[PDB]
Design a protein around this ligand. Structure first.
Ligand SMILES: CCCCCCCCCCCCC/C=C/[C@H](O)[C@H](N)CO
Ligand SMILES: CCCCCCCCCCCCC/C=C/[C@H](O)[C@H](N)CO
Lengths: 237, 300, 235, 300, 235, 150, 300, 235
């Protein structure tokens, strides 16, 4: 007889996803707009599939439902020693839900953000942070969708009715537009905003076997690492 | 309105207070033997003769321990009256029989795709914008007491299969919906390099389970084993599984059926031996919404 | 003082935040309100008001009054459509700039039933029967009356009623539809056909106009406020 | 004095506290079928013979469902005694009849401007500094059963019309207050380029409703349709609408009346057909304050 | 204002922290959940599901289906092992990529009993008796049946049962074992032997396959979530 | 230049706390870690720099160890990571008792392996007094900013 | 849920409040004559004839005042049934007698190492993966009333001895586990410089107690003094001491026995005088787990 | 938000502070403790354990075992001291490296009585009487028995008792003494003398050893934790 006082508190689906995983490194520049090699604003299609770790953890399950905590760690540097110095920068991160106008210039009217939620971050401050509820148009997030957005009908040409396999608007969450609000200093500055994503208040359904070969694209495709297992004798301890 | 919760003290030398400051709950912080703790995830059995409509069948798993059911009024998104064909559509349809040889790498099907041309069920599926149904899948494979071999039957929700090209998600609708013939797994991945007339088809590798996961772990899905020395058949009862209460049956396949030879077929000393495998699927608790002119999807 | 620890997010400015701030004009004696007629509490209250549909957006009619008028005549019966619309109240060009469309273009998600009304503006001596059909999406868009009649539809006796109302009930795979043109959340098709033909006696205009209005029902909701594409500021 | 409110939880794994720190409430954070939820915004009807003073009239909307009323003592800004002419001013006055042709783009009027020369109402309006009144507007247009056409009558609070020049807000007082003749909408915008003697007049484009908004949405305003096959007339009951309980009638026009041909006029096979439209307006619940010498505004 | 003092740790960002933050989309009307079958509450729920063991990781079998099959035959009785395994469910190559191994590779510590199941996939006319042994660590790994029989072991009558289940009970010096290859917390050895031989009649296949599955018992727990080595992202 | 540093967590790199702890054979406690970060220019020319951000990732034994300052491991999807902004008060975190035994062993009179008769002198050899009882992983430290010209 | 504790005021001119903000208690702040306050740390005596099994022995310390005991069910890590040999293993075994001379620097032994070849106790130790036992150690040394000398017997938990090379922790298993012969302390540290065939042995310096600590402080460990003018023997009762409830006896030695001459041996006027010291150790409350084939550690 | 004001001391790090911080490993299932023998609650518990005094720190005895032994013999009676010590338990070289001294060297202040024990390790046939004296400070340190006898002292019959215990009671001007060599808080002097001589019969060793132990009494306390000088780290 043994008294078995061991708990599974850290293996709950809440604890399993209770971490900030980096999903995006967005690069922006503060420079004279006359310069053409400098990108004064950056647009990032919100997704967790730009990186693998959180994607693999989430794809243990078929369906999920959770709130999302986004943290933004902003770093910056000089790209040149001459041409003087710069004053502290302010960054605008505007959420563009699907349909809202997308900025084409770093200073066009869209940055008024009269209705789009916008986050203004001051360099040197603690990393910015916001929370979002569950915003899926379905009753859960679909990590996998075995279907099409269009059904090609008999008669219409091969060009019509064609959609990517497994792609649906269930994962269309808009994008993030990032810019430096300051006017350019006589010296070029380069900044990177790292986006860390934490699911909280998590529920999951339909467990799946985890990814065993390198991810290849947003789907389930595989090309290269198709021999994951090593060699080991049948009767070798 | 402070919440005083208790801590679980470890290293001893005990309550902590939390207050929510925001109106939106999304702003809140996280609050935190053989018996199987997840009894529903270990392929629970129906614990004979299965009769549905005018069809009768004489080793049965209920996927996730959830029997097929109709939409609750509490969870009905569409507002128009739902069509329930009943015995007209809810009956056993027998697909084309496949042949299991010593060299077979496995077979796959999609639901409701495999039943799209099955009597009145297909008519209802193509006449309505929205459709919903569970299934009863009966796999049949009989052989003598001198045959050896094992088949693993897996019901996978959202069974997405990998493509055959460098272009991501490039499998076209026609190849992703073959109907009752289904498709076969392959022993190796072959890249389609015909940039002029790409096949745009799947390349499901058996040991990768066609989706980049090791086949050995496919047992986490609802499953049943047909071991030729023990049983002839396998019954899988699949409830409707989706992120929505009802969806488009033509656009989306809710389930996938995979049959993989876990142990290769063998017999006496005849290297030439083949036994048929027959699938009989009965949709269950069918309901459809959004009646209009019939859909005619593009073929070939 | 009290020991405190600054969590991440400190010193940020979220334009959607909800915080207290000091008053720049303390002890201001505010003018009390009066009972002004016409108070609005919700934007869906405005979305529920019928507004005319610019149905006839042809080259010579668009951006004029004629874009609001659809011409019927007393020709022999045919099964060809009188008008064709897509149930995309925010992205369809004929519905986008209606009050409903204007309100929807400030939000990312919409759900609920729609109410289409058609007003017949011919002479009292004109008679006729029309068919107004809504077909949920998935099939080929109806090209004749034979197909449109298989979906939801109402029959309109213009000689009896000058106005007809058809409710397009909410039927969708998802719980909300996007306010953009999206195949996965397309809303279906709407069309009008001659059931019988339009009949007029002698000394009567043989060509007449109908007007279309669209509003939201009381089960209509929207989500995720967003900036609209219907207004822009150059420089 | 903490306020403990309840959150509406969405994604589940529930009260939040708020305290006001400032004396000024402006410092506080924000606290947050055919049946029409805003019944008052869908042009509610008066649910015959309308008699006001010595005038009688034998399809009636109450704008915002609010009948005209006198100022409440609770909301009276001025302190001097209010003059209420009663039947002397509150009576139906008939404006000049306009002609509806196949080519008409519409007509507009301003209230109280259109009644400034109407019996004792005009005298009271020009003798007092402050004036207030609702209205009953009766539009009359009759035609045979063989005529076809539809008019939309709209009552717009603060009906501001666009100018005709590059100079902003350049329409002069005389052109903005034409009286009972009113003005007409135009089918296109014509820019006034006479920099020497500018017209300084409105250029109200019909499909822009004269204010840069699409005419199709003008139905959000209180309105009534005269469809020639159905009804002869339209009655609009307008309460006093303003940001103030009482204002200057000479400076400010509280309402605007717009009549637009929604369906063009047509008849038999005569391309030359015209029918009159007659407006009869009765001010209601008139009250005036600040008696002094009479105002004589500049004309032409 | 209130006197406060900033303690060390202020303005840091701990990725494992648990703090409140403002909502970027206030007053969002969330879609209610539905009763989806197959909800998971704990990862040990998935760790308790039997999954096939890639036992036969030879050069020509690894990364194919054949790696899941161990070949028995009807040869004369011998005391040599049929298969040999190390009780390292996270680091042993034959157990690392099982569902149990995949879950364990996200944690630093594991404890609890294990459940091995073996399925015999020969003809019904085949008979035989096998011995499945677990030896706790410390001694020389068993090389014959004479040694393996001295540890924990079960005898499996394949003619009677197609499946056999052996529980490897939790026996360890430490309260938790590391999920890496560590001598101080090694788990012991597992082996299979012929008790009798496999016997088949004439006209019967003389070579047959067995399959192996491993799962966790209900007394199984893990600790110290960590990143796994089974997935990597180049560039 | 070393763009990232890995430190095997231990108290034996210094003597004072080690001597205080080794007054006793066994211990059990929670641990509070404080991080004081200092920085300097190594050159006067080549310009200046903007405020730096430091990532401190805890790598428990078994987790992948970064080989480059910017490889995938820094995603820290599961490893606890601490981001510190230069000029802020010293970072701080707490850890519970995380020993696999019932107490921390300051002394262990034994081996992790027992060499068995027959195996060669190379096999079965382990350091005296070394056991996985004190294997707590390491700390990986990097500057998240891209390099300044200095 | 505030905790109001009391302060201890010093300089006077009295309660402080603390609230825990985190769910994890590790996040909490710290809360804060001859009679010996730690009676258990001052080598408490058993306050004759000691009989264990079939062995009998006719100045007894209980280390830390804790008698040997079996594992409580509350603190049992292993789940398999524990083997308790009882009288078969729990009995007094007499090690090889050592010789105390005027020049001896001391002797040391490890437990359970010294009893690894002792009857059935050794068999049980080498047959099981896990083992646990306390001990009764009886040191015997008798001499005339004309002899003078004192021995200090120390039982040290985790008695780690320093090496003899520049390589840290380089003492090999064979030299660290000599068995019943044990080892001897040295008067000075000699560095092993044979880089070709290093001895890989301990170099325990007596005045450093073999571990870099002054020997005078070794009395903090459980101990007993055999002063030849007073007593013949010393009994030490050692409970099982470890960070675990049970461990591997082959890998880990729970106790070490050290005998140091505190006062050198002397007698009459014979410079050549030697008296034997005999150790008799009885394991107590033995229990073993994890039976398998026998362990055979490498030797020499 | 709530108005706050940062007092001086904000953003400092005091190594002796006591504050809460977030947990880097939330929801960790800690291994429960077991009842390990020998738990220490206070360092004065260790300071109360008798440990041998290195009394004989001569050139050839220091850093050997012989430094713990003081040699008596059977010579004729004399009033010269056998050993001389200063009551500086933390700074006296003969007391500094005892367990009591080691603990005291971690603190700045000490107070309380001390317990000296002397063990005689001659033959049972040896007899003798000794005098152990403590003299409070202020006067010339005792040079003979005539002076030491005027202070506190005990007479030890070695033939009767092998061990003698003398308590040095706490007598001090200040409430605490510094753990360094300080004239203003010096502790006094301790010495041993022959009361009678040591007498042995024939065939008996004429030279024998005594050992010294020092511990703290239960009224002993220390204050102001500080770093010790007994350990250093080069580079
Ligand atoms: C206020 C400006 C800062 C940016 C505000 C961001 C708001 C938009 C973020 C919510 C969209 C993502 C919601 C979660 C979706 C997940 O990536 C996947 N669907 C999980 O399956
Ligand atoms: C979140 C990133 C910051 C770094 C997080 C550090 C977490 C890992 C630290 C815990 C490991 C040390 C636990 C205590 C062990 C002691 O050094 C000794 N065993 C004491 O005997």
């Amino acid at each position: 007889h043994v008294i078995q006082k061991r708990t599974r508190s850290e293996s709950t689906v809440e604890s399993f996803f209770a971490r900030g995983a980096c999903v995006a490194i967005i690069e922006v520049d503060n420079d004279a707009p006359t310069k053409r090699a400098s990108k004064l604003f950056s647009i990032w299609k919100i997704t967790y599939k730009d990186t693998v770790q959180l994607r693999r953890k989430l794809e243990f399950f078929t369906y999920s439902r959770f709130d999302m905590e986004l943290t933004f760690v902003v770093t910056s540097n000089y790209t040149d020693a001459n041409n003087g110095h710069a004053l502290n920068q302010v960054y605008q991160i505007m959420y563009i839900p699907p349909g809202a106008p997308i900025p084409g210039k770093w200073n066009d009217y869209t940055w008024q953000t009269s209705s789009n939620p916008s986050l203004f971050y001051t360099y040197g401050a603690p990393p910015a942070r916001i929370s979002v509820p569950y915003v899926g148009i379905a009753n859960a997030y679909s990590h996998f969708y075995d279907g099409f957005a269009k059904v090609p009908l008999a008669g219409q040409a091969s060009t019509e009715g064609d959609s990517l396999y497994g792609a649906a608007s269930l994962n269309d969450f808009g994008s993030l537009a990032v810019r430096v609000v300051n006017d350019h200093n006589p010296t070029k500055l380069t900044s990177k905003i790292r986006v860390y994503m934490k699911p909280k208040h998590v529920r999951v359904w339909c467990p799946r076997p985890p990814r065993a070969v390198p991810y290849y694209g947003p789907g389930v495709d595989y090309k290269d690492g198709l021999a994951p297992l090593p060699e080991k004798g049948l009767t070798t301890y | 309105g402070a919440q005083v919760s208790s801590q679980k003290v470890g290293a001893h030398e005990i309550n902590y207070t939390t207050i929510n400051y925001y109106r939106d709950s999304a702003s809140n912080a996280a609050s935190k033997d053989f018996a199987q703790d997840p009894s529903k995830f270990t392929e629970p059995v129906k614990d004979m003769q299965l009769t549905l409509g005018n069809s009768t069948i004489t080793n049965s798993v209920v996927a996730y321990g959830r029997w097929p059911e109709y939409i609750k009024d509490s969870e009905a998104n569409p507002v128009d009256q739902p069509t329930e064909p009943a015995v007209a559509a809810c009956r056993f349809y027998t697909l084309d029989t496949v042949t299991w040889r010593k060299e077979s790498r496995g077979w796959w099907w999609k639901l409701p795709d495999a039943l799209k041309d099955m009597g009145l069920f297909g008519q209802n599926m193509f006449y309505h914008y929205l459709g919903r149904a569970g299934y009863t899948v009966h796999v049949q494979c009989n052989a003598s007491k001198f045959h050896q071999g094992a088949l693993g039957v897996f019901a996978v929700p959202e069974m997405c299969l990998a493509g055959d090209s460098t272009t991501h998600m490039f499998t076209k609708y026609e190849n992703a919906n073959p109907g009752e013939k289904g498709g076969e797994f392959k022993g190796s991945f072959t890249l389609d390099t015909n940039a002029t007339n790409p096949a745009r088809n799947f390349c499901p590798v058996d040991y990768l389970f066609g989706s980049g996961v090791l086949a050995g772990n496919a047992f986490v899905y609802p499953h049943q084993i047909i071991n030729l020395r023990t049983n002839n058949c396998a019954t899988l009862v699949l409830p409707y599984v989706n992120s929505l209460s009802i969806d488009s049956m033509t656009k989306h396949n809710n389930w996938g059926i995979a049959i993989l030879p876990l142990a290769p077929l063998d017999f006496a000393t005849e290297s030439s031996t083949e036994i048929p495998i027959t699938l009989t699927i009965a949709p269950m608790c069918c309901e459809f919404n959004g009646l209009r002119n019939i859909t005619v999807p593009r073929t070939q | 003082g009290l020991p405190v620890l600054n969590t991440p997010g400190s010193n940020q400015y979220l334009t959607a935040d909800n915080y207290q701030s000091p008053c720049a004009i303390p002890e201001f004696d505010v003018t009390p309100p009066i009972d002004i007629p016409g108070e609005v509490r919700n934007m869906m209250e405005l979305a529920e008001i019928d507004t005319m549909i610019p149905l006839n957006l042809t080259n010579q009619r668009k951006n004029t009054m004629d874009m609001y008028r659809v011409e019927l005549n007393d020709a022999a019966h045919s099964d060809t459509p009188i008008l064709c619309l897509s149930l995309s109240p925010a992205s369809d060009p004929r519905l986008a700039h209606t009050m409903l469309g204007e309100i929807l273009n400030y939000y990312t998600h919409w759900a609920g039933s729609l109410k289409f009304t058609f007003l017949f503006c011919g002479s009292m001596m004109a008679t006729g029967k029309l068919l107004v059909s809504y077909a949920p999406p998935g099939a080929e868009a109806p090209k004749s009356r034979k197909e449109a009649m298989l979906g939801t539809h109402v029959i309109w006796d213009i000689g009896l009623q000058s106005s007809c109302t058809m409710v397009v009930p909410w039927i969708s795979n998802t719980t909300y539809r996007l306010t953009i043109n999206d195949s996965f959340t397309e809303g279906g098709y709407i069309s009008m056909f001659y059931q019988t033909r339009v009949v007029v006696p002698l000394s009567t205009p043989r060509k007449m106009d109908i007007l279309g209005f669209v509003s939201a029902c009381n089960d209509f909701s929207v989500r995720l406020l967003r900036d609209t594409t219907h207004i822009s500021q150059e420089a």
